[PDB]
Structure 1
Amino acid sequence: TDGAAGLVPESNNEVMALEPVAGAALAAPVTGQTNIIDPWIRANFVQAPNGEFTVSPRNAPGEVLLNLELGPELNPYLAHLARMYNGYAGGMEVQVMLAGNAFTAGKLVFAAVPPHFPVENLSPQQITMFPHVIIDVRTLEPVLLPLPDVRNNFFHYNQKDDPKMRIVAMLYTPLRSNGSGDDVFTVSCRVLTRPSPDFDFTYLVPPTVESKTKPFTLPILTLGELSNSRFPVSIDQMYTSPNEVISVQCQNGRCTLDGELQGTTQLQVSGICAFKGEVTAHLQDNDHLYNITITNLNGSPFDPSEDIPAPLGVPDFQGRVFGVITQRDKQNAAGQSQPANRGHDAVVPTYTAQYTPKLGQVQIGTWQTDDLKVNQPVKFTPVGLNDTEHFNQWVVPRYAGALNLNTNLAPSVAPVFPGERLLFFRSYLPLKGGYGNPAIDCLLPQEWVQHFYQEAAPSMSEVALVRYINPDTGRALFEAKLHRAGFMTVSSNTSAPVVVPANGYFRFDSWVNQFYSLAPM
Structure 2
Amino acid sequence: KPFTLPILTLGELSNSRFPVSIDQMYTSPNEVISVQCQNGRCTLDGELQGTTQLQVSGICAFKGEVTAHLTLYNITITNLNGSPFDPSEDIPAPLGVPDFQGRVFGVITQRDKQNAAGQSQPANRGHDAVVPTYTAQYTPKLGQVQIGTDLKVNQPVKFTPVGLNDTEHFNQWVVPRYAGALNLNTNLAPSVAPVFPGERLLFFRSYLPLKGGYGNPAIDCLLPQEWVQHFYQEAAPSMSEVALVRYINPDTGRALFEAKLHRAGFMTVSSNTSAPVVVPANGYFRFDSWVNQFYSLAPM
Which of the five TM-score ranges fits, normalised by the shorter chain?
over 0.9
Q: How far is 1:237 from its partner?
A: 0.7
C-alpha separation in 1, matches of 2:187 and 2:228: 20
C-alpha separation in 1, matches of 2:142 and 2:119: 39
C-alpha separation in 1, matches of 2:125 and 2:205: 34
C-alpha separation in 1, matches of 2:25 and 2:117: 52
Report whether the alignment pairs 1:362 with 2:149. Answer: no
Q: How far is 1:474 from its partner?
A: 3.1
Q: Decide which of 18, 21, 29 is 1:242's aligned counterpart.
A: 29
Q: How far is 1:248 from its partner?
A: 0.3
Report whether the alignment pairs 1:280 with 2:67. Answer: yes
Q: Map Cα deviations across residues 43-76 of structure 1 (whole Å, 9 max, x no partner).
A: xxxxxxxxxxxxxxxxxxxxxxxxxxxxxxxxxx
- 2:299 matched to which residue of 1? 520
- 1:227 matched to which residue of 2? 14
Report whether the alignment pairs 1:263 with 2:46. Answer: no
Q: How far is 1:334 from its partner?
A: 5.0
Q: Map Cα deviations across residues 90-126 of structure 1 (whole Å, 9 max, x no partner).
A: xxxxxxxxxxxxxxxxxxxxxxxxxxxxxxxxxxxxx
Q: How far is 1:413 from its partner?
A: 0.6
Q: Map Cα deviations across residues 167-211 of structure 1 (whole Å, 9 max, x no partner).
A: xxxxxxxxxxxxxxxxxxxxxxxxxxxxxxxxxxxxxxxxxxxxx
C-alpha separation in 2, matches of 1:480 and 1:449: 18
Q: How far is 1:358 from its partner?
A: 0.5
Q: How far is 1:327 from its partner?
A: 0.8
Q: How far is 1:466 from its partner?
A: 0.7
Q: How far is 1:375 from its partner?
A: 1.2
Q: Tell me if the contact between 2:92 and 2:141 (Cα under 8 Å) persists in the aligned partners.
A: yes
Give the secondary-structure state (helix, strand or coil) at the position aligned to 1:355.
coil
C-alpha separation in 2, matches of 1:490 and 1:310: 31
C-alpha separation in 1, matches of 2:278 and 2:118: 56
Q: Tell me if the contact between 2:15 and 2:225 (Cα under 8 Å) persists in the aligned partners.
A: yes
C-alpha separation in 2, matches of 1:360 and 1:450: 27
Structure 1 residues 439, 334: CA separation in 2 closer, same or farther (over 3 Å shift)?
Answer: farther
Q: How far is 1:352 from its partner?
A: 0.8
C-alpha separation in 2, matches of 1:340 and 1:299: 19
Q: Percent identity, please.
A: 100
Q: How far is 1:480 from its partner?
A: 0.7
Report whether the alignment pairs 1:343 with 2:126. Answer: yes
Give the secondary-structure state (helix, strand or coil) at the position aligned to 1:467.
strand
Aligned pairs, how many? 298
C-alpha separation in 2, matches of 1:217 and 1:407: 31
Q: How far is 1:472 from its partner?
A: 3.1
* Aligned 1:303-382 pairs, distance under 5 A: 303-334=86-117, 336-365=119-148, 371-382=150-161
C-alpha separation in 1, matches of 2:9 and 2:244: 18
Moved over 4 A (4+): none
Q: Map Cα deviations across residues 209-244 of structure 1 (whole Å, 9 max, x no partner).
A: xxxxx2212221111101100000000110000111
Larger Rg: 1
Give the secondary-structure state (helix, strand or coil) at the position aligned to 2:240.
coil
Q: Map Cα deviations across residues 229-265 of structure 1 (whole Å, 9 max, x no partner).
A: 0000000110000111100000000000111111000
Q: How far is 1:503 from its partner?
A: 1.6
Q: Tell me if the contact between 2:113 and 2:156 (Cα under 8 Å) persists in the aligned partners.
A: yes
C-alpha separation in 2, matches of 1:305 and 1:489: 35
Give the secondary-structure state (helix, strand or coil) at the position aligned to 2:213.
strand
C-alpha separation in 2, matches of 1:330 and 1:480: 51
Q: Tell me if the contact between 2:107 and 2:159 (Cα under 8 Å) persists in the aligned partners.
A: yes
Q: Tell me if the contact between 2:69 and 2:151 (Cα under 8 Å) persists in the aligned partners.
A: no
Q: Tell me if the contact between 2:4 and 2:286 (Cα under 8 Å) persists in the aligned partners.
A: no
Give the secondary-structure state (helix, strand or coil) at the position aligned to 1:280.
strand
Give the secondary-structure state (helix, strand or coil) at the position aligned to 1:435.
coil
Could you say what the CA RMSD is over the residues aligned between the two structures, in angstroms? 1.0
Q: Map Cα deviations across residues 409-461 of structure 1 (whole Å, 9 max, x no partner).
A: 11111111121111001100110111111010000001110111011111111
C-alpha separation in 2, matches of 1:474 and 1:303: 50
Give the secondary-structure state (helix, strand or coil) at the position aligned to 2:160.
strand
User: Higher mean Cα deviation, 438-447 or 471-480?
Assistant: 471-480
Unaligned residue ranges in structure 2 (runs of 5+): none
Q: Map Cα deviations across residues 374-393 of structure 1 (whole Å, 9 max, x no partner).
A: 11111000000011111100
C-alpha separation in 1, matches of 2:117 and 2:222: 49
C-alpha separation in 1, matches of 2:51 and 2:122: 33
- 2:75 matched to which residue of 1? 292
Give the secondary-structure state (helix, strand or coil) at the position aligned to 1:441.
strand
Which TM-score applies when normalising by structure 2?
A: 0.97
C-alpha separation in 1, matches of 2:16 and 2:118: 41
C-alpha separation in 2, matches of 1:309 and 1:489: 26
Q: How far is 1:335 from its partner?
A: 5.1
